Amino acid sequence: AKFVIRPATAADCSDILRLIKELAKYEYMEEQVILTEKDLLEDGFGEHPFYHCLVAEVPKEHWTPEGHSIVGFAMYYFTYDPWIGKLLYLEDFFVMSDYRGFGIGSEILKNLSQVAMRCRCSSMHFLVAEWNEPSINFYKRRGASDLSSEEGWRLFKIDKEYLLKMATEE
Amino acid sequence: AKFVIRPATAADCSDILRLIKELAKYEYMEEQVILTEKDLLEDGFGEHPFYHCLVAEVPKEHWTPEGHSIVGFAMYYFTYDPWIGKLLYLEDFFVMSDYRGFGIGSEILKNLSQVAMRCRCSSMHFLVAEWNEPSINFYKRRGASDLSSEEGWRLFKIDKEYLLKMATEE
Ligand SMILES: CC(C)(COP(=O)(O)OP(=O)(O)OC[C@H]1O[C@@H](n2cnc3c(N)ncnc32)[C@H](O)[C@@H]1OP(=O)(O)O)[C@H](O)C(=O)NCCC(=O)NCCS
Numbered sequence A, B: 001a002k003f004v005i006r007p008a009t010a011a012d013c014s015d016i017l018r019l020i021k022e023l024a025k026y027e028y029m030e031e032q033v034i035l036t037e038k039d040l041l042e043d044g045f046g047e048h049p050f051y052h053c054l055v056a057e058v059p060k061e062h063w064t065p066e067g068h069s070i071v072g073f074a075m076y077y078f079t080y081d082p083w084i085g086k087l088l089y090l091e092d093f094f095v096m097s098d099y100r101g102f103g104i105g106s107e108i109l110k111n112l113s114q115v116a117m118r119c120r121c122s123s124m125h126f127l128v129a130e131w132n133e134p135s136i137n138f139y140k141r142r143g144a145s146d147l148s149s150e151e152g153w154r155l156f157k158i159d160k161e162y163l164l165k166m167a168t169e170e
């Protein structure tokens, strides 16, 4: 269960999509993943990357039965709030079950925190499902607070089909 | 009443800051504004910035009692979704009280939608306050859906002091 945490490089895109799907098919949303390798590659390693990713890599002897060395990841990016400051936004955080409990998640969180201090971020933001009490307590044990409930904020979206109408108006 | 919406310029910073403060008041967050004009110019237009702003100008006949032409604005940046990829995230959106109900907001959303199409964003995300009925309806009547209801998401935060604790722990 030896492993190291490191930034993902262009060569890692197949693995990231693999872990996204593995994450999805851990929540049975696997088919919902429209994202392709070309997208991960053009969106993360071009001139202006739209996301950043730290991955967990295991040695040859610990490869997955499928034969893969990356067994976990965290996807994130920086955002900004005029009344909070510059923020590190944690989008996805996942470690394959047969590799959990060996400190991988802990190391990722420590390095994301260090990256936050480097970037002079005032806070780390992320989403948690209201019913997922185990995940909620994990984060509260780390000092997190439910901003949506304490301050009365709801997350909204306007999907592509509506943005298209409005954009092509008249 | 022929208002115009367009990208902001460095010379717009003073109006942008003023509007951010009016929006903060509207949200009961005035005291927590940490943005200064310096920051806006720096972060907003300092070569490959952190965020993007749009402003809406009215003609002379309707300038503000204080003589301002910028009567509203939108602040946005891009985020990422592992399932569908690049998203457009709307951080702040505001229209001065005397200038609501005339179509100014609609046009800003129309401009944001075009930004979305060009940059190939699949959706636009943003937060709305619990009691902001006006915005909730404005958004919904334009295709928005409340993800906190539909998917149970809660925005969580871990501020700097706890990030420091996790960064220096191991
Ligand atoms: C929580 C998560 C990061 C744990 O990763 P990990 O590699 O197992 O982390 P570690 O091995 O460093 O141990 C982390 C901790 O989880 C606890 N843990 C015990 N069983 C666990 C399990 N089956 N799964 C996850 N964590 C477990 C460990 O005891 C340890 O204690 P602590 O949380 O009180 O500090 C996990 O990988 C995960 O992704 N969980 C949920 C998915 C997610 O991230 N959801 C986000 C919702 S906002």
Ligand SMILES: CC(C)(COP(=O)(O)OP(=O)(O)OC[C@H]1O[C@@H](n2cnc3c(N)ncnc32)[C@H](O)[C@@H]1OP(=O)(O)O)[C@H](O)C(=O)NCCC(=O)NCCS
Binding pocket: B023, B026, B092, B093, B094, B095, B099, B100, B101, B102, B103, B104, B105, B106, B107, B127, B128, B129, B132, B134, B135, B137, B138, B139, B141
């Ligand atoms: C909700 C708000 C932001 C919309 O901005 P706006 O400039 O009023 O937007 P518009 O004028 O384009 O649309 C206003 C509305 O009245 C209607 N309207 C606009 N122009 C109209 C016209 N010419 N004739 C008839 N109705 C009109 C629109 O249909 C819309 O109503 P709906 O929400 O029921 O669909 C509004 O300004 C407000 O109350 N803002 C408060 C501050 C706030 O909440 N800011 C966001 C913090 S995140």
